[PDB]
Structure of Bifunctional purine biosynthesis protein PurH:
Amino acid sequence: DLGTENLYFQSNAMRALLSVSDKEGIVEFGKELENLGFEILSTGGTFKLLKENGIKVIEVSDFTILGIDLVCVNLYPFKKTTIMSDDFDEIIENIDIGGPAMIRSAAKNYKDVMVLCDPLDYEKVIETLKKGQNDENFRLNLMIKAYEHTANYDAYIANYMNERFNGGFGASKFIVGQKVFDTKYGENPHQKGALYEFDAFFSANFKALKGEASFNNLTDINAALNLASSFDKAPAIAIVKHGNPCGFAIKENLVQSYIHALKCDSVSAYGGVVAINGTLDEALANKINEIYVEVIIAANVDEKALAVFEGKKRIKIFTQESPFLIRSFDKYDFKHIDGGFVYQNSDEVGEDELKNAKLMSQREASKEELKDLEIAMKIAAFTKSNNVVYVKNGAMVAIGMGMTSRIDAAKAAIAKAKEMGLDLQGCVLASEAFFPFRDSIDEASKVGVKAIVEPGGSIRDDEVVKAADEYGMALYFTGVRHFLH
Amino acid sequence: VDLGTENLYFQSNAMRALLSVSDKEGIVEFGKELENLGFEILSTGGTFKLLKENGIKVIEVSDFTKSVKTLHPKIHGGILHKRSDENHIKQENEILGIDLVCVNLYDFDEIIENIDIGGPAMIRSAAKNYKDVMVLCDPLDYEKVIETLKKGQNDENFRLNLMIKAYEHTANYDAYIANYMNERFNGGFGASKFIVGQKVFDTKYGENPHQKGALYEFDAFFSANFKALKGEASFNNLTDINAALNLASSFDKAPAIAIVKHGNPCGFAIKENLVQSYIHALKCDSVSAYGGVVAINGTLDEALANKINEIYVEVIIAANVDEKALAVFEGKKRIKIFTQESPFLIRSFDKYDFKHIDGGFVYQNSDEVGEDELKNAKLMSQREASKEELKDLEIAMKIAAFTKSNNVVYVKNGAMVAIGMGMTSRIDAAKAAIAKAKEMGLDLQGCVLASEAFFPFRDSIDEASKVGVKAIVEPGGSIRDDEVVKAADEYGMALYFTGVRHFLH
């Protein structure tokens, strides 16, 4: 006889409407509402499930006068259906209609009604009711959660449609994040900040063993983690300072990788961010504890290794509880500009970028030199342009960036390497953008560079190839530019 | 009054349209065109009165959008059986099918009470039934819809693309509501954050040719305040425009000129007029200025256009451009010219900033150089800066704060004379800055210096003494700050500590 169309909002009705797609914990919640003195209204399968479990419930029909003060409604699993199937008609069937209208209408009437759209909130709601804490502020926070839920549902639908039919660049783009935590401050102490995630990447794969990451720590962790996880199971160590790499090495073991990464620039590593592709043991911990680093992120950390930093107050230690580092692979990238944002496909160093590169020179690089070029390419692509990266025997030996000219950047890189007492003879060089003139090769000959990898594409490419041939260097043109602001 | 939404059903070939819109632009002509195509028209509230008033044959339906408060609007989610034309002739007023749904959406008690419930429910229900009904949420699509119908082009794919627009519209509405609630009650950092953009255009590519790119806007800032007079902006042009525009609009109505190359400033000046400001901005680094981006806080006239045209630049963005100034660049191909059709440059002033990291984003308040940052700074030295030196420090502070850190900015008589950045040390950055200034044949004696990070040792001051720096502005905060103060006192320099850091990655 009664339908949802005959139900209206009324404070003190002590009558709950329970109509859910996700039926998890609905029986116990219905039993707890009944014990609290609520009359229960329900539809379809929810009604049959409640009645079956001895709950006193009255059936109302779906639209496809009685007052209510609790609306417990959740939606058709659209997200789960799109992940599990490509059948478009099945996907359209899992678009909930009616459910969001009920959630949004109850939310707008929060002064008089409680709105529940998440089974994870049932136990909290019951305890609030038992403690006599169902006040206007409690219902206002449920109203905020309700509009976040319906906004997220339709944003997911719109993003999925635009990914399937408009190559991921639709008329309206929704960048939706779920808060992980607030940071102590933003880029500067006078700014507030927070970390947001698209799914569960940070929630599921990061555990703070000591301290709390700052806003700048997180962008530095991202950069160090992306570099140290780019070489499979190899014992990579990445050292980052102010968003740029200042150290990188792969050696026989993690302790040797750390000592050689640190050799490139000890000065900048003081207060840096260290990413370890493997176990942080007691030995590695003491080696790092010779200087004061701000952050250490390891795949897994030993108890004795954590104890080594009991003295340092501002050091932060993170674990992924994994044998090797786990990274995220976002398909799209975005940059804030005043008034909006620019959106694009994520840049990536292709697995066959060096393998498919054109050999331009008389000389071919050796197997060890090709490994060093691979390391140099990846560092250059992850570093903010215009840059030059010098790698020797699995370790970065010099890096230049930020200058108006790379000839000026290279001279600053060589100056730091001389200061560090590093032998650059036999090293390889990578740049993420083409070298415009042969002076780039002539400057490289001074330090005994043996192999070069660059995208190629200059009008003076012929004189660059000739200069490499004069010095007997290996030269590869990838045809892939990796500029990064 | 008589008909209600409970009497309406989605039905293919019903030849009956429901028109109920907040944005009433072009609804009269669209209603007239639907009526000429043989559609019967149903309408509510203000839309009904507007249509009836303009001689359109329309029947009223109780207002479902406006607001005993019922649980949900009486909107049927299913479809009525599709009937043939000969079945309609052979043949009813209690059950009316609809095949076109044209609906679009618009004190704490006032905002909450005005949340539309019936409108989104109607839009979302029609959209799900796209195989049978047309859903219209954008007045910009009315003319296209009429031509599609006249040409017999209304097919399942056409209705599918309308369904996508419908869910973008209802997603945008609830995302704006959730963001407002979190701004009011959770300081703008809610449990779910929605960064929503509307596409302006696709760029030819992204940061690199192998990437696809596009420009998105919040509340139509780029659509309403930017007009391309010549060429098309690339993805990298847009981030360079942003940087040059933000600098040149930081001094109110002053005749600022900003020159940017690869996201960093390579020129800046404020002189008596825009022509003089350009001349003095270019002096700092003529070389990097080649193929750069120029932002003009005012009119680009024939005289200034002719002075810029002496070299090659990729982009010019001015507040307003004279016809004669645009004509100067008729021959060349590579240059791009933009206008804001305004007396002075217009910024958006976004309250929040965000950075992409894999798996998500970091979110924060937007940084800003406060109007009284230098005025409230502590004078640490013997010597106080003059009125002209304080103006130069203000310019140097703002350039340093907008430039990617760690940096050093040298300003003299309203013009930037040197800039150093990028490398691991600010002593290394300063030596590169002095080298470029010597190459440019610029006199640095009497200039001021700014850094938006504290100087850790007196060696920063001793290097500044070589070029005759007279005043320094820094946030302060080092251990040996008293040693940095002693050095500035030995050379007779003015030294200010603002206590505000502006680090920028």
Chain B has three domains: 1-186, 225-348, 375-505.
